[PDB]
Design an enzyme around this catalytic site. Sequence first.
Site, PDB file in Angstrom:
ATOM      1  N   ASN A 109       0.941  -1.389   0.055  1.00 19.76           N
ATOM      2  CA  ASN A 109       0.031  -0.293  -0.188  1.00 19.76           C
ATOM      3  C   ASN A 109       0.828   1.330   0.008  1.00 19.76           C
ATOM      4  O   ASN A 109       1.644   1.427   0.786  1.00 19.76           O
ATOM      5  CB  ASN A 109      -0.765   0.015   1.208  1.00 19.76           C
ATOM      6  CG  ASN A 109      -0.458   0.639   2.356  1.00 19.76           C
ATOM      7  OD1 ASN A 109      -0.219   1.695   2.477  1.00 19.76           O
ATOM      8  ND2 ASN A 109      -0.121  -0.441   3.414  1.00 19.76           N
ATOM      9  N   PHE A 113      -1.601   8.448   3.835  1.00 18.71           N
ATOM     10  CA  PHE A 113      -2.491   9.304   4.910  1.00 18.71           C
ATOM     11  C   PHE A 113      -3.720   9.909   4.078  1.00 18.71           C
ATOM     12  O   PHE A 113      -3.932  11.199   3.924  1.00 18.71           O
ATOM     13  CB  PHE A 113      -2.029  10.091   5.715  1.00 18.71           C
ATOM     14  CG  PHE A 113      -0.691   9.769   6.775  1.00 18.71           C
ATOM     15  CD1 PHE A 113      -1.100   8.609   7.012  1.00 18.71           C
ATOM     16  CD2 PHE A 113       0.047  10.490   7.257  1.00 18.71           C
ATOM     17  CE1 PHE A 113       0.246   8.034   8.164  1.00 18.71           C
ATOM     18  CE2 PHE A 113       0.882   9.978   8.063  1.00 18.71           C
ATOM     19  CZ  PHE A 113       1.250   8.875   8.590  1.00 18.71           C
ATOM     20  N   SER A 180       5.434   5.491   8.815  1.00 17.84           N
ATOM     21  CA  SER A 180       4.717   5.493   7.290  1.00 17.84           C
ATOM     22  C   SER A 180       5.751   5.475   6.152  1.00 17.84           C
ATOM     23  O   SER A 180       6.605   6.500   6.187  1.00 17.84           O
ATOM     24  CB  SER A 180       3.389   6.599   7.163  1.00 17.84           C
ATOM     25  OG  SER A 180       2.846   6.223   5.716  1.00 17.84           O
ATOM     26  N   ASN A 182       4.786   5.849   2.962  1.00 16.81           N
ATOM     27  CA  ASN A 182       4.281   6.444   2.014  1.00 16.81           C
ATOM     28  C   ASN A 182       4.061   8.165   2.294  1.00 16.81           C
ATOM     29  O   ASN A 182       3.515   8.668   1.619  1.00 16.81           O
ATOM     30  CB  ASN A 182       2.732   6.128   1.745  1.00 16.81           C
ATOM     31  CG  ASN A 182       2.841   4.323   1.859  1.00 16.81           C
ATOM     32  OD1 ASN A 182       3.541   3.690   1.319  1.00 16.81           O
ATOM     33  ND2 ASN A 182       2.117   4.229   2.836  1.00 16.81           N
ATOM     34  N   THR A 183       4.555   8.355   3.410  1.00 16.52           N
ATOM     35  CA  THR A 183       4.742  10.025   3.802  1.00 16.52           C
ATOM     36  C   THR A 183       6.227  10.363   3.711  1.00 16.52           C
ATOM     37  O   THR A 183       6.980  10.000   4.681  1.00 16.52           O
ATOM     38  CB  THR A 183       3.872  10.262   5.280  1.00 16.52           C
ATOM     39  OG1 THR A 183       2.905   9.865   5.002  1.00 16.52           O
ATOM     40  CG2 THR A 183       3.978  11.765   5.452  1.00 16.52           C
ATOM     41  N   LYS A 229       4.136   3.956  17.062  1.00 17.92           N
ATOM     42  CA  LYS A 229       4.265   2.721  15.686  1.00 17.92           C
ATOM     43  C   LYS A 229       5.670   3.024  15.259  1.00 17.92           C
ATOM     44  O   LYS A 229       6.172   4.128  14.656  1.00 17.92           O
ATOM     45  CB  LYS A 229       2.921   2.840  15.057  1.00 17.92           C
ATOM     46  CG  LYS A 229       2.787   1.710  14.442  1.00 17.92           C
ATOM     47  CD  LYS A 229       1.736   1.717  13.436  1.00 17.92           C
ATOM     48  CE  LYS A 229       1.209   0.273  12.795  1.00 17.92           C
ATOM     49  NZ  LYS A 229      -0.074   0.130  12.493  1.00 17.92           N
ATOM     50  N   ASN A 258       4.861  -1.689  11.728  1.00 18.29           N
ATOM     51  CA  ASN A 258       4.135  -1.152  10.585  1.00 18.29           C
ATOM     52  C   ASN A 258       4.733  -2.143   9.189  1.00 18.29           C
ATOM     53  O   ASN A 258       5.216  -2.865   9.690  1.00 18.29           O
ATOM     54  CB  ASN A 258       4.597   0.294  10.320  1.00 18.29           C
ATOM     55  CG  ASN A 258       3.405   1.339   9.863  1.00 18.29           C
ATOM     56  OD1 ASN A 258       2.742   0.831   8.734  1.00 18.29           O
ATOM     57  ND2 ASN A 258       3.488   2.564  10.516  1.00 18.29           N
TER      58      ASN A 258
HETATM   59  C1  LIG Z   1      -4.331  -0.136   3.180  1.00 21.95           C
HETATM   60  C2  LIG Z   1      -3.609   0.045   4.459  1.00 21.95           C
HETATM   61  C3  LIG Z   1      -3.512   1.222   5.134  1.00 21.95           C
HETATM   62  C4  LIG Z   1      -2.608   1.361   6.210  1.00 21.95           C
HETATM   63  N1  LIG Z   1      -2.628   2.542   6.801  1.00 21.95           N
HETATM   64  C5  LIG Z   1      -2.294   2.871   8.167  1.00 21.95           C
HETATM   65  C6  LIG Z   1      -2.205   4.130   8.648  1.00 21.95           C
HETATM   66  O1  LIG Z   1      -3.078   4.929   8.453  1.00 21.95           O
HETATM   67  N2  LIG Z   1      -1.787   4.157  10.097  1.00 21.95           N
HETATM   68  C7  LIG Z   1      -1.021   3.053  10.508  1.00 21.95           C
HETATM   69  O2  LIG Z   1      -0.250   3.130  11.545  1.00 21.95           O
HETATM   70  N3  LIG Z   1      -0.856   1.757   9.924  1.00 21.95           N
HETATM   71  C8  LIG Z   1      -1.397   1.641   8.791  1.00 21.95           C
HETATM   72  N4  LIG Z   1      -1.484   0.374   7.989  1.00 21.95           N
HETATM   73  C9  LIG Z   1      -0.562  -0.604   8.496  1.00 21.95           C
HETATM   74  C10 LIG Z   1      -1.630  -1.626   9.504  1.00 21.95           C
HETATM   75  O3  LIG Z   1      -2.093  -0.812  10.591  1.00 21.95           O
HETATM   76  C11 LIG Z   1      -0.708  -2.784   9.933  1.00 21.95           C
HETATM   77  O4  LIG Z   1       0.237  -2.521  10.884  1.00 21.95           O
HETATM   78  C12 LIG Z   1      -0.289  -3.528   8.772  1.00 21.95           C
HETATM   79  O5  LIG Z   1      -1.021  -3.793   7.754  1.00 21.95           O
HETATM   80  C13 LIG Z   1       0.813  -4.781   9.161  1.00 21.95           C
HETATM   81  O6  LIG Z   1      -0.264  -5.760   9.794  1.00 21.95           O
HETATM   82  P1  LIG Z   1      -1.119  -7.059   9.056  1.00 21.95           P
HETATM   83  O7  LIG Z   1       0.139  -7.861   8.102  1.00 21.95           O
HETATM   84  O8  LIG Z   1      -1.814  -7.921   9.846  1.00 21.95           O
HETATM   85  O9  LIG Z   1      -2.138  -6.426   7.974  1.00 21.95           O
HETATM   86  C14 LIG Z   1      -2.199   0.206   6.878  1.00 21.95           C
HETATM   87  C15 LIG Z   1      -2.082  -0.932   6.120  1.00 21.95           C
HETATM   88  C16 LIG Z   1      -2.941  -1.053   4.949  1.00 21.95           C
HETATM   89  C17 LIG Z   1      -2.984  -2.677   4.178  1.00 21.95           C
HETATM   90  O1  LIG Z   2      -1.433   6.064   5.135  1.00 22.91           O
HETATM   91  C1  LIG Z   2      -0.613   5.143   4.510  1.00 22.91           C
HETATM   92  O2  LIG Z   2      -0.545   5.133   3.383  1.00 22.91           O
HETATM   93  C2  LIG Z   2       0.050   4.197   5.478  1.00 22.91           C
HETATM   94  C3  LIG Z   2       0.527   4.730   6.813  1.00 22.91           C
HETATM   95  C4  LIG Z   2       1.184   3.502   7.776  1.00 22.91           C
HETATM   96  O3  LIG Z   2       1.760   4.075   8.922  1.00 22.91           O
HETATM   97  N1  LIG Z   2       1.246   2.310   6.995  1.00 22.91           N
HETATM   98  C5  LIG Z   2       1.244   2.192   5.672  1.00 22.91           C
HETATM   99  O4  LIG Z   2       1.678   0.911   5.326  1.00 22.91           O
HETATM  100  N2  LIG Z   2       0.325   3.137   5.014  1.00 22.91           N
END
Ligand SMILES: Cc1cc2nc3c(=O)[nH]c(=O)nc-3n(C[C@H](O)[C@H](O)[C@H](O)COP(=O)(O)O)c2cc1C
Ligand SMILES: O=C(O)c1cc(=O)[nH]c(=O)[nH]1
Length: 367
Positions: A109, A113, A180, A182-183, A229, A258
């Site tokens: 991804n 944000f 992040s 992507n930031t 995080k 993350n």
């Molecule tokens: C589409 C998408 C958007 C995400 N956006 C955020 C976000 O805004 N903030 C954040 O701290 N983590 C974000 N994450 C990360 C998740 O909180 C999580 O830590 C990550 O997906 C790893 O866990 P998983 O393997 O169980 O999916 C995002 C993940 C995905 C797939």
């Molecule tokens: O907002 C996102 O794109 C984002 C934030 C974050 O902490 N982790 C991630 O994979 N995506």
Amino acid sequence: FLYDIFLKFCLKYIDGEICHDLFLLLGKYNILPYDTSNDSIYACTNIKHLDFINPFGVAAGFDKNGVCIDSILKLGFSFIEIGTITPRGQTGNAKPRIFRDVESRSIINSCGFNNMGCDKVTENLILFRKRQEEDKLLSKHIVGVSIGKNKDTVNIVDDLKYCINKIGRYADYIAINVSSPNTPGLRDNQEAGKLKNIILSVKEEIDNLEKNNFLWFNTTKKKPLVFVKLAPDLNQEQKKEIADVLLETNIDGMIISNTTTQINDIKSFENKKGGVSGAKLKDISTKFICEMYNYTNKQIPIIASGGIFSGLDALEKIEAGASVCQLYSCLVFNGMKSAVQIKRELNHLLYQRGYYNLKEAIGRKHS
Ligand SMILES: Cc1cc2nc3c(=O)[nH]c(=O)nc-3n(C[C@H](O)[C@H](O)[C@H](O)COP(=O)(O)O)c2cc1C
Ligand SMILES: O=C(O)c1cc(=O)[nH]c(=O)[nH]1
Ligand SMILES: Cc1nnc2c3ccccc3c(N3CCc4ccccc4C3)nn12
């Protein structure tokens, strides 16, 4: 069964974020399934005063805008980290920015944000917190808030302190998103010195709400806890440097971890931008839990995140040093049944291993 057939079709025929925006819509209109159980106290866990009914919660980025809190928590989860929120709303990066590999159970991804902004999300949390008063079924369910920075902002702190002054009164915990990918330039905030200023300034601003301003309109009725995080793409030198900051500043928790930029062994995520989450991150996040649990000398509680799909995956995290398990890719690949199956799967294993409770398992790998 009904949502499981429909989710399989969705993963193989409909776009990743359309799916995501579709189910969230079926959530805002309260037509998603329900998981009804008081949950055995056997699996009860806590991070300071934060009393989790079960060890499973929904990680940040799922309900970015807090428009679906009730329906997501009613799927069998004890807590939700809403966000990441930024002071001003953002459309994020160019679409498609969410991709999935079903064979390897992973997500990539580059969202960047995408949110409605801190002010609108605050109003969405106010409405859930108001519902939480009438509705007794969600009175012990914790809601965390992940706070970030806008793309173009040069000073992360100003943005984090802005967020606190608006949504801080309604959060049980505040998560600092310094991880992040992507930031642009955000992971540079994980550097010991910068993170020390970040945490301190954030903690000063939470403390100031109590000093300047019934007040804590959250679950706890207490001031929000502070969690950070952390990114898995760090050297051992940084990971230990950070630990000294977290021990000195006294962070109330640390979310490990993350998404990663290190996983390049997925053929479908080759030239796609973003961080990899899912079944490939599993081992990476567990070893980062392990490292940090000993770099912080067991003092800083851990919120596991990264590749948790099963009770065994969950126990692996708990035993490495995790107090709670945060889900994301499990809800995407396994569907609505995630928290029902994972609580059940874990409880089977907690009995099988011989633990009196979950709190007995936290960090037992290091024993
Ligand atoms: C589409 C998408 C958007 C995400 N956006 C955020 C976000 O805004 N903030 C954040 O701290 N983590 C974000 N994450 C990360 C998740 O909180 C999580 O830590 C990550 O997906 C790893 O866990 P998983 O393997 O169980 O999916 C995002 C993940 C995905 C797939
Ligand atoms: O907002 C996102 O794109 C984002 C934030 C974050 O902490 N982790 C991630 O994979 N995506
Ligand atoms: C199917 C599918 N293909 N891609 C995705 C996806 C991508 C990012 C975040 C969530 C999801 C998601 N979920 C599925 C589970 C769920 C539960 C409550 C509220 C919303 C959702 C949406 N389902 N999904």
